[PDB]
Each structure stands twice: as C-alpha cells, then as structure tokens.
Amino acid sequence: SPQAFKFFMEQHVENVLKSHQQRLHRKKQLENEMMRVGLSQDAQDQMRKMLCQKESNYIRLKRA
C-alpha cells in the first residue's frame, strides 16, 4: 500500500523546514547571548565554530 510513502512525504516537507529553522534558532540564540555579554571576536568565533561542529555532529547522528 502507498500509505506509508504518502504519510512520510506529507510529514517530510515540514520536518525539512522545521530542522532548518531550528538550526537558525540555535544560531540566533548563540549570537544573541554572545553580543549581550560582549565577548571578544576571537571568543565569539571559537564558539560559533563549536556550534557548527555540534550541528554537523547532530545530522551525522540523525543519519545514524
């Protein structure tokens, strides 16, 4: 039956978009707090880097 393919695709499109806005959200949250406490641009870049690696790690794990 095609019901599983159908349900998945209907569910898939919104999952794609949610994952995309959640990445942006976490990115925005980090920038926000950084700017609030006024870290050095070196410290900011370090932590941005750390967030990127974590996001990378995250989708590897979803794939697993």
Binding site: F5, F8, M9, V13, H20, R23, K49, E55, N57, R60
Partner: protein
C-alpha cells in the same frame, strides 16, 4: 557512458502535473549548505533521505513494474540503462532497480563511506561516491515518471512524487551533483519545477 546509453535511432505528456506538491516552502534555501556545515556531511544526510524516499516510491509501483511491462531499464524509449558497479548488463527495469537499490544500500551501510561515528572523517573520494549514487537514483524517478505515471496518478500520489523529486533535483542542482546530460530524460519536468 556505457551504463547510460541514449538512443540516437529514436525519432523523439501528463507529467506536467507538476503544480501538484505538498508544502515545499522555501526549498531552494532549504537545500543550501548551512554556514559552517561540512559539504560531505550535508551530501551524506540528504543522499540517505533521498534513498529512503525513492525506496518507498518504488515500493508503491513495483507491482506495476514487471518483466513484461519493462523488459529494459529505460526512461522512455530514447534512454536505456545498463547495470554495472565496477566491483554492463542489459536488464529489465525491475532487475536494474533491484541491483541499484541493493548497491546504494551497501554504500550507506559502509561505515568507511558513510561514517556514523563522530570524529571519523569521510573517505577522500566521498564526493565521487555520492555523485554516482545520486546519478543512478535519478533513474528510478525517470523510469517511474516515464513508464508508470499512470499508476502514480492511480494511487493519487503524484503530489508526493513531485515533492520528493523536486527536492531531489533542487539539491542535485545546488551542488551540481549530476551532469546535465544524464538529466536529459526529465529536462522539461525539471525546467517546469524551476
């Protein structure tokens, strides 16, 4: 090149049901590599997702795809496909697609190609490996579109197919993962989705 044989001896539809989709949203933006993200990782997770979608897609119409209906793997009469994996066979569409999907599955299960442990890098040639997979996965779409759109419309799953394929092709195009030549079997469906 030996696996992909366009037929110059052939003189050259309802496929343009293309408006039918689900909520794709800003899909062009969705397929883009996020800032800081590793291209390999981004290719890998999407290739897996596309494989799953295609695996389910073919599952819906496999009863209609038989030796009788599709004695050669094709995307319409002007394009035939012969199977080969370097580790070429004129065969039927069901045979070809069984070869293909087992093959792709083995790649994804191959930890040395698709590492699942954090810290383990991709193989040096991962891009080429990913590009062969997507290249060949495209052929399931093309076969189904050309040979079985009647059955797709019967199952009223045209929207779901278009959504999957549109996302697949937007991803492929963003990163130029398939040569325009091999996309020939669906140029006008593709131009219709952009």
């Amino acid at each position: 090149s030996k696996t992909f044989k366009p037929k110059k001896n052939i003189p050259e539809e309802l496929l343009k049901h293309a408006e039918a989709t689900l909520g794709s949203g800003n899909l062009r933006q969705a397929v883009m590599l996020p800032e800081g993200e590793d291209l390999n990782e981004w290719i890998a997770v999407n290739t897996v997702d596309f494989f799953n979608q295609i695996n389910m897609l073919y599952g819906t119409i496999t009863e209609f795809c038989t030796e009788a209906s599709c004695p050669v793997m094709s995307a319409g009469p002007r394009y035939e496909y012969h199977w080969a994996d370097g580790t070429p066979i004129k065969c039927s569409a069901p045979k070809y697609i069984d070869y293909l999907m087992t093959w792709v599955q083995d790649q994804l299960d191959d930890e040395t190609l698709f590492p699942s442990k954090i810290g383990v890098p991709f193989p040096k040639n991962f891009m080429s490996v990913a590009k062969t997979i997507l290249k060949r996965l495209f052929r399931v779409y093309a076969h189904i579109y050309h040979q079985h759109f009647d059955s797709v419309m019967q199952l009223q799953e045209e929207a779901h197919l278009n959504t999957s394929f549109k996302h697949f092709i937007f991803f492929v195009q963003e990163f130029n993962l398939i040569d325009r030549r091999e996309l020939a079997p669906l140029q006008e469906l593709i131009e219709k989705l952009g």
